[PDB]
mmCIF file with all atom_site columns, C-alpha atoms in Angstrom:
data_model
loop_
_atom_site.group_PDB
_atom_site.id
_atom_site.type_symbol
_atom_site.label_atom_id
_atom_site.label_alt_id
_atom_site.label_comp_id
_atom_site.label_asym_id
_atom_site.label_entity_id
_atom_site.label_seq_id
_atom_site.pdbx_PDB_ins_code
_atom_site.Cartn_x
_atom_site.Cartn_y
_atom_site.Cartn_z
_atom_site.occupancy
_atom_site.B_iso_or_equiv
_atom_site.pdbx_formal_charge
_atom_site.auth_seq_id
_atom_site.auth_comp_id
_atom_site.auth_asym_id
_atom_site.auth_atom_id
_atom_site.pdbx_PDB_model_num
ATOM 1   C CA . UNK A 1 1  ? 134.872 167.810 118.387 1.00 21.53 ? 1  UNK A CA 1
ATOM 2   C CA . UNK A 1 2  ? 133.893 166.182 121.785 1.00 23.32 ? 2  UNK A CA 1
ATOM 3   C CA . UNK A 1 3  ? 135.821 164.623 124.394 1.00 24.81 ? 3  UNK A CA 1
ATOM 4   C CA . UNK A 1 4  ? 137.568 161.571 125.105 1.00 26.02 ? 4  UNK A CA 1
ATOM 5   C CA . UNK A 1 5  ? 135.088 160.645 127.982 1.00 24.57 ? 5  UNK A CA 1
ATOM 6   C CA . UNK A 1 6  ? 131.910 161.062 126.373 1.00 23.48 ? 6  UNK A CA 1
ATOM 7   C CA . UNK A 1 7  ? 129.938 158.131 127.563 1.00 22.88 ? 7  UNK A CA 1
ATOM 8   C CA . UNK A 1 8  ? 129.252 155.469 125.045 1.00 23.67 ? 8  UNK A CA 1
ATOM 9   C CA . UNK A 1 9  ? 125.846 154.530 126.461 1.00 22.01 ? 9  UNK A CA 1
ATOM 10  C CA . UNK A 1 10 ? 124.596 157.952 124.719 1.00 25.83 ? 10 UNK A CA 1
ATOM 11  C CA . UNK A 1 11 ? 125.128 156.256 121.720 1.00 27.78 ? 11 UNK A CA 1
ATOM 12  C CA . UNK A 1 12 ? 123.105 153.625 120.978 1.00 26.42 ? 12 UNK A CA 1
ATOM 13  C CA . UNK A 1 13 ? 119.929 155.106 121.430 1.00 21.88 ? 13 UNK A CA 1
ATOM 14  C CA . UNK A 1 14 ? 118.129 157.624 119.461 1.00 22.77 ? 14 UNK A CA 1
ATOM 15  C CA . UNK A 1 15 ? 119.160 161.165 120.333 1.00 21.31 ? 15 UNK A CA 1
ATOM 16  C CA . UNK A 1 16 ? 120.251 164.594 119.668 1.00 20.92 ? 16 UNK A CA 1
ATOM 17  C CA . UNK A 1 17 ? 124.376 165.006 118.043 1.00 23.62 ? 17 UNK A CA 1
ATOM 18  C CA . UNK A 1 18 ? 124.755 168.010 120.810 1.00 19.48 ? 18 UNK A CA 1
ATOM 19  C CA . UNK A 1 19 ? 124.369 166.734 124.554 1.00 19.64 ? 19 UNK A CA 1
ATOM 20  C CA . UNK A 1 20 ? 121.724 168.165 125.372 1.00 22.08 ? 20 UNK A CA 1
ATOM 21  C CA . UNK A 1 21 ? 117.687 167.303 123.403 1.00 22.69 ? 21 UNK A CA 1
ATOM 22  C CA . UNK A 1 22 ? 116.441 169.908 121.698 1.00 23.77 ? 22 UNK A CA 1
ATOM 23  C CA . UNK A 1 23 ? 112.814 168.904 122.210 1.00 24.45 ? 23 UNK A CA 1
ATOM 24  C CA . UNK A 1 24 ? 111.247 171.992 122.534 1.00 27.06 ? 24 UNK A CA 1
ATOM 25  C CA . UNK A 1 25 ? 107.581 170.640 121.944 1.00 29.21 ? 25 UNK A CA 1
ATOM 26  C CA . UNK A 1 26 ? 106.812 169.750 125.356 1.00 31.19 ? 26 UNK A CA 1
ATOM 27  C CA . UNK A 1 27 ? 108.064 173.509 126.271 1.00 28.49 ? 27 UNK A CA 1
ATOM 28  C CA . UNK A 1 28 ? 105.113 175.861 126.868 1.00 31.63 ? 28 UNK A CA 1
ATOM 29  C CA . UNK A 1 29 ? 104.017 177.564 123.591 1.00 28.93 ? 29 UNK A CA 1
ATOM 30  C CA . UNK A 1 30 ? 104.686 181.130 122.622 1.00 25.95 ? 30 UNK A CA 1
ATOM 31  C CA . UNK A 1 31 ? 107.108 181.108 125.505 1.00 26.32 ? 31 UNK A CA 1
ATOM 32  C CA . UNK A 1 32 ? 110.490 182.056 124.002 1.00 25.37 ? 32 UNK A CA 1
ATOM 33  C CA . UNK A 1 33 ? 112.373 182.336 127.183 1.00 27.62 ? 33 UNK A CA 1
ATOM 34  C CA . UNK A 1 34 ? 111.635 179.334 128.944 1.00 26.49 ? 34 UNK A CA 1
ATOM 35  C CA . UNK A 1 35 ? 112.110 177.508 125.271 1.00 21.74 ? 35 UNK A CA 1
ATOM 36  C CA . UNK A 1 36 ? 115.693 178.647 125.613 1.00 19.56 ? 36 UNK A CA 1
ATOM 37  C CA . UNK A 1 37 ? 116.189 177.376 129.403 1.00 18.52 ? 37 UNK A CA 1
ATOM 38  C CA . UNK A 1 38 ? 115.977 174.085 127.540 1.00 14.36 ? 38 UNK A CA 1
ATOM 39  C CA . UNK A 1 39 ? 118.672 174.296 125.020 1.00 15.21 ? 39 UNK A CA 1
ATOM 40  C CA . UNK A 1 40 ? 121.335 176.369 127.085 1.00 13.78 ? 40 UNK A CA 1
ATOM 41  C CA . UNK A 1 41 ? 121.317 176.550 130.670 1.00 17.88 ? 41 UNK A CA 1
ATOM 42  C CA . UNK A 1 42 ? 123.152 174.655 133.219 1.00 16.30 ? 42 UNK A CA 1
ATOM 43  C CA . UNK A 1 43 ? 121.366 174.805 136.566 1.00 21.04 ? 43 UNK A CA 1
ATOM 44  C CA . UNK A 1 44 ? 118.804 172.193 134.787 1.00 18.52 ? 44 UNK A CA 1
ATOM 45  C CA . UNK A 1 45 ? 120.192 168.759 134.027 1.00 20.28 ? 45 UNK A CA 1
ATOM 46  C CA . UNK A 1 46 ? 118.977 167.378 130.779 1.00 16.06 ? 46 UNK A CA 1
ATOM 47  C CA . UNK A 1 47 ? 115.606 166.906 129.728 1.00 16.51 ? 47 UNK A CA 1
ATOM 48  C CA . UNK A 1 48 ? 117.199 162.762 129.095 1.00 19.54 ? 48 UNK A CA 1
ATOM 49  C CA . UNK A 1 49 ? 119.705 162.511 131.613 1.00 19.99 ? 49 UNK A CA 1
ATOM 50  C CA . UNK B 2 1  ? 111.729 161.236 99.471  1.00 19.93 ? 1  UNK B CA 1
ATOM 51  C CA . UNK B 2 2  ? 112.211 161.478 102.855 1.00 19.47 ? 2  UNK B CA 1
ATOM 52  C CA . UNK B 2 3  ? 115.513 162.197 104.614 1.00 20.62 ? 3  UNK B CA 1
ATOM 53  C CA . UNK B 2 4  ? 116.967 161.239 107.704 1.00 21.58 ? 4  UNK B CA 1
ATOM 54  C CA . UNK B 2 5  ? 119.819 162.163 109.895 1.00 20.98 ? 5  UNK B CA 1
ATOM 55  C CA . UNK B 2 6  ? 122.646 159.237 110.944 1.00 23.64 ? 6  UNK B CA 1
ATOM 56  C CA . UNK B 2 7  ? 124.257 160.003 113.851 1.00 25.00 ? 7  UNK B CA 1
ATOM 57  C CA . UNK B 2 8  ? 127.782 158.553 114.140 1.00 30.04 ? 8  UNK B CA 1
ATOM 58  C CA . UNK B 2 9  ? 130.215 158.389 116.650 1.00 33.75 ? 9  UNK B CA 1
ATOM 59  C CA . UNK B 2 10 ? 134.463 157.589 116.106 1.00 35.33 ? 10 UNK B CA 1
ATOM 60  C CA . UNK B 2 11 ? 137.651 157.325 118.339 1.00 32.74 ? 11 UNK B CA 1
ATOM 61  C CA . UNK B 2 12 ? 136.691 157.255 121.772 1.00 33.69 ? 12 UNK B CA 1
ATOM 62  C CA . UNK B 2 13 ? 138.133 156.496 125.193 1.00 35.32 ? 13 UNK B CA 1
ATOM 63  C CA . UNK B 2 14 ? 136.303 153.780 127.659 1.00 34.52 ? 14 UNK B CA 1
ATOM 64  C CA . UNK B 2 15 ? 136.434 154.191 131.855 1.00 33.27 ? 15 UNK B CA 1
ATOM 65  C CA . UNK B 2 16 ? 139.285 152.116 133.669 1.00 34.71 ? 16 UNK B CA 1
ATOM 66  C CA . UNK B 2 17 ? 137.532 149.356 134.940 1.00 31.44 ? 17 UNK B CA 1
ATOM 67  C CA . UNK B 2 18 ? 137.527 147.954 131.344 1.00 33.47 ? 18 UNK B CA 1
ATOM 68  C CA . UNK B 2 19 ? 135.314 144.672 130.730 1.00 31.46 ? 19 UNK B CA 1
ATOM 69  C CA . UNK B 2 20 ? 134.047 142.316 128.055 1.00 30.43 ? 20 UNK B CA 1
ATOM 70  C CA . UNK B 2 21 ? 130.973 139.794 127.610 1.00 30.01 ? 21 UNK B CA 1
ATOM 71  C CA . UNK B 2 22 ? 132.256 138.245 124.400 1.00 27.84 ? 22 UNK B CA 1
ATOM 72  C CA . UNK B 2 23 ? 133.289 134.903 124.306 1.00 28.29 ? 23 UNK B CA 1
ATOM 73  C CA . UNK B 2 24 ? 135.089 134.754 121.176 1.00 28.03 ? 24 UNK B CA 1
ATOM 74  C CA . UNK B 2 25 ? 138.013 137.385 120.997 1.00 27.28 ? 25 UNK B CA 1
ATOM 75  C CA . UNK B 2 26 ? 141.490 137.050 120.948 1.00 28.91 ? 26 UNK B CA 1
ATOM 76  C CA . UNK B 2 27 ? 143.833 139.590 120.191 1.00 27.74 ? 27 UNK B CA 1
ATOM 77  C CA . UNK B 2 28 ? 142.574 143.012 120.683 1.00 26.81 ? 28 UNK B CA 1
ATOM 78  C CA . UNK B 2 29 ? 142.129 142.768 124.620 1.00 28.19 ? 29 UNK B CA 1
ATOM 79  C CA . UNK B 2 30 ? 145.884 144.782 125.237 1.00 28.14 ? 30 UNK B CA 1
ATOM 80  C CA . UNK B 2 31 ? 144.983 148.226 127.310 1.00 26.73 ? 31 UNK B CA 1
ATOM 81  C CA . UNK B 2 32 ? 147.958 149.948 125.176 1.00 29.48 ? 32 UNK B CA 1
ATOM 82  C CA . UNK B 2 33 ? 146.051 150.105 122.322 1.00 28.05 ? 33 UNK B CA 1
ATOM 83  C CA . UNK B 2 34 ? 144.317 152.812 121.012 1.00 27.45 ? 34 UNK B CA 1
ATOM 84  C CA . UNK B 2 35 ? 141.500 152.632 118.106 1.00 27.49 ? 35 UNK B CA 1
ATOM 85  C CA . UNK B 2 36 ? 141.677 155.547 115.823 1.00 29.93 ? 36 UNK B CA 1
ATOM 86  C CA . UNK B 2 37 ? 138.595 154.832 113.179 1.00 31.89 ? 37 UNK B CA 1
ATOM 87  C CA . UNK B 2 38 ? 135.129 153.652 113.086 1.00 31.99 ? 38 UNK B CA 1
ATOM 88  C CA . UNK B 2 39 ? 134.160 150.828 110.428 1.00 30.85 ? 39 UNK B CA 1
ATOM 89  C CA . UNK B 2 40 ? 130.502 152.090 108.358 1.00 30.86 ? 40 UNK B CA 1
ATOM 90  C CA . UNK B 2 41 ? 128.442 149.259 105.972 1.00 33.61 ? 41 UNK B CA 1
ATOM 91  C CA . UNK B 2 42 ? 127.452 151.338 102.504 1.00 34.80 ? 42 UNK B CA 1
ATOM 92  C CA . UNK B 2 43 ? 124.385 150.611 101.116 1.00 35.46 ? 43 UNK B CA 1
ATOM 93  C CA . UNK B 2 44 ? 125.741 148.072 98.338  1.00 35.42 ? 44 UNK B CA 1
ATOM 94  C CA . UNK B 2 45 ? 126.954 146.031 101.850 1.00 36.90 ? 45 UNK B CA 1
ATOM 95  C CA . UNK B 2 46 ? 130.688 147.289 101.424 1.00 37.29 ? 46 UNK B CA 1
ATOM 96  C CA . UNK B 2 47 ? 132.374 148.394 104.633 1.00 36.42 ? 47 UNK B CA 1
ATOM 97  C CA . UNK B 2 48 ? 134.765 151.590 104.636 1.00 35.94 ? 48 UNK B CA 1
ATOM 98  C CA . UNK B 2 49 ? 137.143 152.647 107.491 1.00 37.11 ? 49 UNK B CA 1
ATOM 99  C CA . UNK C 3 1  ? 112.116 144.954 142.540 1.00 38.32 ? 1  UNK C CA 1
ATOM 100 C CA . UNK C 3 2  ? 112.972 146.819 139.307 1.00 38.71 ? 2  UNK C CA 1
ATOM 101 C CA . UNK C 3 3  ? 116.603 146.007 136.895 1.00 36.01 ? 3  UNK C CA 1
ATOM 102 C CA . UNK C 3 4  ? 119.496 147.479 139.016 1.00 33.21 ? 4  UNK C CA 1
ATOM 103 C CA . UNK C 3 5  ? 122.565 145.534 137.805 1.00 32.01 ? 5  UNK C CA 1
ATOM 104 C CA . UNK C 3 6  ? 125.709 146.946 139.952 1.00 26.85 ? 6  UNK C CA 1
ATOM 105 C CA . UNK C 3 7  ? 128.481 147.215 136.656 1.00 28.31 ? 7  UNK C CA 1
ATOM 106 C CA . UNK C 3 8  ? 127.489 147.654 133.383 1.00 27.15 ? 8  UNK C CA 1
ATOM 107 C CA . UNK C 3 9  ? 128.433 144.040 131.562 1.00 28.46 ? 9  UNK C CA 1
ATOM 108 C CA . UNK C 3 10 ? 125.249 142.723 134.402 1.00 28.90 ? 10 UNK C CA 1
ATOM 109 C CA . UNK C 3 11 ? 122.808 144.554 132.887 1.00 27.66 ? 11 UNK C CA 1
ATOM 110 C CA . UNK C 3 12 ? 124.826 143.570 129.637 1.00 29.66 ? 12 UNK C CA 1
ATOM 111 C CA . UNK C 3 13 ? 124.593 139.728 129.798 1.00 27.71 ? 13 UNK C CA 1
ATOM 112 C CA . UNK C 3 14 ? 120.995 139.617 131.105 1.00 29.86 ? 14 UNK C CA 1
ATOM 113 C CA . UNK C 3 15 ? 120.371 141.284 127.738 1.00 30.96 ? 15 UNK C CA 1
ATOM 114 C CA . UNK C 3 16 ? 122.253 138.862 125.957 1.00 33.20 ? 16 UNK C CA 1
ATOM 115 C CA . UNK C 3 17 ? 120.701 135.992 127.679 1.00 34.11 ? 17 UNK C CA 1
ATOM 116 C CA . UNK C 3 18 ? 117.500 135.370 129.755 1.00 33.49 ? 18 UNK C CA 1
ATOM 117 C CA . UNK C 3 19 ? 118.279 132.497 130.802 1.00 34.45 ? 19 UNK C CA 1
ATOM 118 C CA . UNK C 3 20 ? 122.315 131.972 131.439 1.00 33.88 ? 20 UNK C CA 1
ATOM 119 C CA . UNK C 3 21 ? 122.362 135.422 133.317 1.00 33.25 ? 21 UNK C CA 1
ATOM 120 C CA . UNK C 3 22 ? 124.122 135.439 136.538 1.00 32.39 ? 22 UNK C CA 1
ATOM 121 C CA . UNK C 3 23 ? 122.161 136.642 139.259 1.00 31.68 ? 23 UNK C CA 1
ATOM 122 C CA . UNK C 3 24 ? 125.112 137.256 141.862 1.00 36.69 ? 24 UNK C CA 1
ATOM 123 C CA . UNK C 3 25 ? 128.815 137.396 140.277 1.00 37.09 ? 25 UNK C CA 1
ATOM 124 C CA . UNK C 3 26 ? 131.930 138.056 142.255 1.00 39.72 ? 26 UNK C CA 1
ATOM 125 C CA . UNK C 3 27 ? 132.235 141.455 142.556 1.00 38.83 ? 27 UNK C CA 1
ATOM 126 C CA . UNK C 3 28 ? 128.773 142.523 141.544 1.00 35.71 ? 28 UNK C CA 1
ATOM 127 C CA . UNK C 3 29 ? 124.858 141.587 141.696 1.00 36.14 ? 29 UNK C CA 1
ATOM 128 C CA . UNK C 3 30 ? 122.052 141.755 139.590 1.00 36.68 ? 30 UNK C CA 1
ATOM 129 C CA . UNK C 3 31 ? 118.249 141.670 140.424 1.00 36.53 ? 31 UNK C CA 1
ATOM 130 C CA . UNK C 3 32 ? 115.887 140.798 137.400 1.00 37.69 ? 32 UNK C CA 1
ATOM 131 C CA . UNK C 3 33 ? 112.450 142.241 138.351 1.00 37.20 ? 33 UNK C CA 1
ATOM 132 C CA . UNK C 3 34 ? 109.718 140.919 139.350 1.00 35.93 ? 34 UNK C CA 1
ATOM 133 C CA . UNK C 3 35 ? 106.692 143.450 138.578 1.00 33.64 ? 35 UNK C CA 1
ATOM 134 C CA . UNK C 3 36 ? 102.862 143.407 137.990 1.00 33.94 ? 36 UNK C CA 1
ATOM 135 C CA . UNK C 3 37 ? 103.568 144.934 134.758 1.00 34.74 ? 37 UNK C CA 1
ATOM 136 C CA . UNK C 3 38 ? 106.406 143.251 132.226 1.00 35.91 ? 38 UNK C CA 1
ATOM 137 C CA . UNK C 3 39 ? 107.897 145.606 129.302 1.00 34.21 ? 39 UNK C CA 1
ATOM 138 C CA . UNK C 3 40 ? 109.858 144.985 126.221 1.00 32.90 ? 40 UNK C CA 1
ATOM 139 C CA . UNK C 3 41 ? 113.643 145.916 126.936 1.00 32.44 ? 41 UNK C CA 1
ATOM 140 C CA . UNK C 3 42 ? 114.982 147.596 123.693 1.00 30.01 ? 42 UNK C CA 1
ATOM 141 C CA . UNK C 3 43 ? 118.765 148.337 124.119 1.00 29.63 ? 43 UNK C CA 1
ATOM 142 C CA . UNK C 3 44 ? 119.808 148.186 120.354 1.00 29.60 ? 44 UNK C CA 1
ATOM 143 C CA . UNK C 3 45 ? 118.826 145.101 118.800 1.00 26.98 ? 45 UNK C CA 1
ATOM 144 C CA . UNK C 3 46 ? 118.023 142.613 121.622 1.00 21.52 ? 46 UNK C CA 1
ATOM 145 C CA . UNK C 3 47 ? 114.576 142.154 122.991 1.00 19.99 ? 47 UNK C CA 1
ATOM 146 C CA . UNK C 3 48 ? 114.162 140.839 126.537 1.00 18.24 ? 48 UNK C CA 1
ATOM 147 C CA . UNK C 3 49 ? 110.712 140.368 127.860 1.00 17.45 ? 49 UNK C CA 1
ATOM 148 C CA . UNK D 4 1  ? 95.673  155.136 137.482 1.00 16.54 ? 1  UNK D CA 1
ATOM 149 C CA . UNK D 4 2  ? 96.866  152.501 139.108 1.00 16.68 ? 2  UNK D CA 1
ATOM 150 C CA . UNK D 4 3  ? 100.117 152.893 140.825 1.00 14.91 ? 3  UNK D CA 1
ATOM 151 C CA . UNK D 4 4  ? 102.454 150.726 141.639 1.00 14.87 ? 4  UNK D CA 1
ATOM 152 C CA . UNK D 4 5  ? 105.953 151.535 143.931 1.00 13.38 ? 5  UNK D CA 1
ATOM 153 C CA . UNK D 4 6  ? 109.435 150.150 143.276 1.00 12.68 ? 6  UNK D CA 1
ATOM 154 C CA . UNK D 4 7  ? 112.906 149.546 144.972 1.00 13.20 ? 7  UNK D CA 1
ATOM 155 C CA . UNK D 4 8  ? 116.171 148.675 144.264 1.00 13.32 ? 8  UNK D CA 1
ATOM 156 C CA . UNK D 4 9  ? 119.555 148.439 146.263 1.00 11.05 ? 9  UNK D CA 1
ATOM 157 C CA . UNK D 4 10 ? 122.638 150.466 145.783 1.00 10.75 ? 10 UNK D CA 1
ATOM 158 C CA . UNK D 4 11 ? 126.235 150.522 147.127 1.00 9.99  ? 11 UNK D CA 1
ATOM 159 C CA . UNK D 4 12 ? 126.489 146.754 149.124 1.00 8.24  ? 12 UNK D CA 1
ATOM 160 C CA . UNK D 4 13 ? 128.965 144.417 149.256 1.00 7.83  ? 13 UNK D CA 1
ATOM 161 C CA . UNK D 4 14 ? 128.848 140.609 149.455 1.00 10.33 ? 14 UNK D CA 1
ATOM 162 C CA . UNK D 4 15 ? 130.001 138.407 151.847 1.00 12.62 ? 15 UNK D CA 1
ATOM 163 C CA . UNK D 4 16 ? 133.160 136.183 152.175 1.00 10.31 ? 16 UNK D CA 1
ATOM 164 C CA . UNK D 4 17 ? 133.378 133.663 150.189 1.00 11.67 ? 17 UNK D CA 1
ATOM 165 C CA . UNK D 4 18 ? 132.439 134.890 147.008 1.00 13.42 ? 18 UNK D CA 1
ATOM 166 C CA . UNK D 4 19 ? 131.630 132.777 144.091 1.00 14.32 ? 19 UNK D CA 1
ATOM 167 C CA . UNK D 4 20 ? 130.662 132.604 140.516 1.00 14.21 ? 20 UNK D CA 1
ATOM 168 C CA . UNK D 4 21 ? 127.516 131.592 138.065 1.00 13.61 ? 21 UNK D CA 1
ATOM 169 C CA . UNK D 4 22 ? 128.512 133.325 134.360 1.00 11.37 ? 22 UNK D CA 1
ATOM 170 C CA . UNK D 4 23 ? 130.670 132.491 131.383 1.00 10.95 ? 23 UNK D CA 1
ATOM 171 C CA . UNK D 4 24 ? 131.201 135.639 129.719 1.00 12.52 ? 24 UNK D CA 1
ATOM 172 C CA . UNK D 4 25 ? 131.929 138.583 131.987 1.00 10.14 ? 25 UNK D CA 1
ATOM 173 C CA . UNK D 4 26 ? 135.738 138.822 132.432 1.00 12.73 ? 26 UNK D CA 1
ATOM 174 C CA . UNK D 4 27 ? 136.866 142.464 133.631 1.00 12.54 ? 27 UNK D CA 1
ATOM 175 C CA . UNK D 4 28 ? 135.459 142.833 136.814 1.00 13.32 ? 28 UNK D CA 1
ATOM 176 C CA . UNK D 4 29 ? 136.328 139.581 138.687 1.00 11.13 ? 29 UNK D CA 1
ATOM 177 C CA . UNK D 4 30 ? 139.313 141.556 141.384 1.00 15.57 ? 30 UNK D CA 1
ATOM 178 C CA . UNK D 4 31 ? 138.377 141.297 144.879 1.00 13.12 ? 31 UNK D CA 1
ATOM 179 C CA . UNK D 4 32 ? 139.449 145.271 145.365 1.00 10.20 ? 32 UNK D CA 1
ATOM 180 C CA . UNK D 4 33 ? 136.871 146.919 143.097 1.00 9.27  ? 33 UNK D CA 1
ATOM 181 C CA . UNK D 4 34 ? 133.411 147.802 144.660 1.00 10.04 ? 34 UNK D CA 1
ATOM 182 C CA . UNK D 4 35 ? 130.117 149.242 143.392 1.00 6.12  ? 35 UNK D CA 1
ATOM 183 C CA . UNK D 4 36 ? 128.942 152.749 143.594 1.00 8.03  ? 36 UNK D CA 1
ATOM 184 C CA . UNK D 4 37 ? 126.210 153.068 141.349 1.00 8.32  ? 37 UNK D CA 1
ATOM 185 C CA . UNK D 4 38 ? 123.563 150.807 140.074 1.00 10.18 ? 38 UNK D CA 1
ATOM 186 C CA . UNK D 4 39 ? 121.864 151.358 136.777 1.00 12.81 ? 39 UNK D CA 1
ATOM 187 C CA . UNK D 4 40 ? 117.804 151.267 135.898 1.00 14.80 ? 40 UNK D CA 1
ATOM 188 C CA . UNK D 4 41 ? 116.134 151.075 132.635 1.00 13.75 ? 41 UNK D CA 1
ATOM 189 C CA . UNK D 4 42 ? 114.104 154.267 131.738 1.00 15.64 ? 42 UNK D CA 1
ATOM 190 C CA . UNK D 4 43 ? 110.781 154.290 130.469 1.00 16.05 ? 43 UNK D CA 1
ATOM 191 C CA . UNK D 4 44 ? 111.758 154.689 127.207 1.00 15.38 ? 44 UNK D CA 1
ATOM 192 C CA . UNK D 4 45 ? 114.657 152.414 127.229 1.00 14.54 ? 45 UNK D CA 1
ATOM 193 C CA . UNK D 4 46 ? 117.493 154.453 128.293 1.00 16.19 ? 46 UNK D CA 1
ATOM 194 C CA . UNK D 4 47 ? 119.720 152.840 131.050 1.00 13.66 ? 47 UNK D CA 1
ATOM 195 C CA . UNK D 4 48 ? 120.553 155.807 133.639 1.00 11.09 ? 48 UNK D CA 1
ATOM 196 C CA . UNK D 4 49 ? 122.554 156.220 136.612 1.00 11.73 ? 49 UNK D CA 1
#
């Protein structure tokens, strides 16, 4: 499930089914903590958008 | 083998000021309707609703 | 000047069309760059140098 | 690393008597609606906001 507003322009290119990527490569290695300030915080808008 | 992912989206809303580019539509322009399914192509070519 | 098209169906039709693309519409404007460096435009399918 | 700088325009509105140069865009052509946003292509071909 996901809204009625999600924005179509998400959709054509290449990306991750949740809204937020996942790429946790360019993260800093054998950092667990900032790893997960990609994936579920809010104060940082999208590593995409 | 190698596997991939398809992401797929169905049933969404699009923002009030509604537009087209196409020059070659007729019918489906009315703002009371609603689109409830997504059309796929199968890999024999077939689509499915 | 970069590709800032003021609605979303600009940026839509200069896709669509290099050539037939309206630089100034109505309501809205378009401004198709003109830069020391020119990219390929991948949005889908269509490929505007 | 040769560095180039950029610009685009956001938020204007044109003057008077305003005219027409497409075919194809249909939605947008009131005289009430105005621009708040422009949109420019990523690097890697993702239009933003």
């Amino acid at each position: 499930p996901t809204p009625v507003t999600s924005d179509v322009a998400y959709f054509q290119t290449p990306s991750n089914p949740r809204g937020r990527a996942a790429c946790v490569v360019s993260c800093d290695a054998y950092s667990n903590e900032s790893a997960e300030r990609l994936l579920y915080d809010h104060s940082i808008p999208d590593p995409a958008y | 083998r190698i596997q991939y992912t398809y992401f797929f989206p169905v049933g969404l809303h699009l923002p009030v000021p509604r537009y087209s580019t196409s020059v070659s539509v007729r019918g489906v322009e009315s703002p009371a309707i609603q689109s409830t399914e997504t059309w796929v192509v199968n890999k024999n070519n077939v689509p499915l609703c | 000047p970069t590709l800032a098209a003021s609605h979303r169906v600009m940026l839509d039709e200069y896709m669509s069309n290099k050539q037939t693309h309206a630089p100034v519409h109505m309501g809205q404007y378009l401004i198709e760059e003109v830069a020391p460096m020119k990219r390929l435009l991948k949005l889908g399918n269509k490929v505007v140098y």
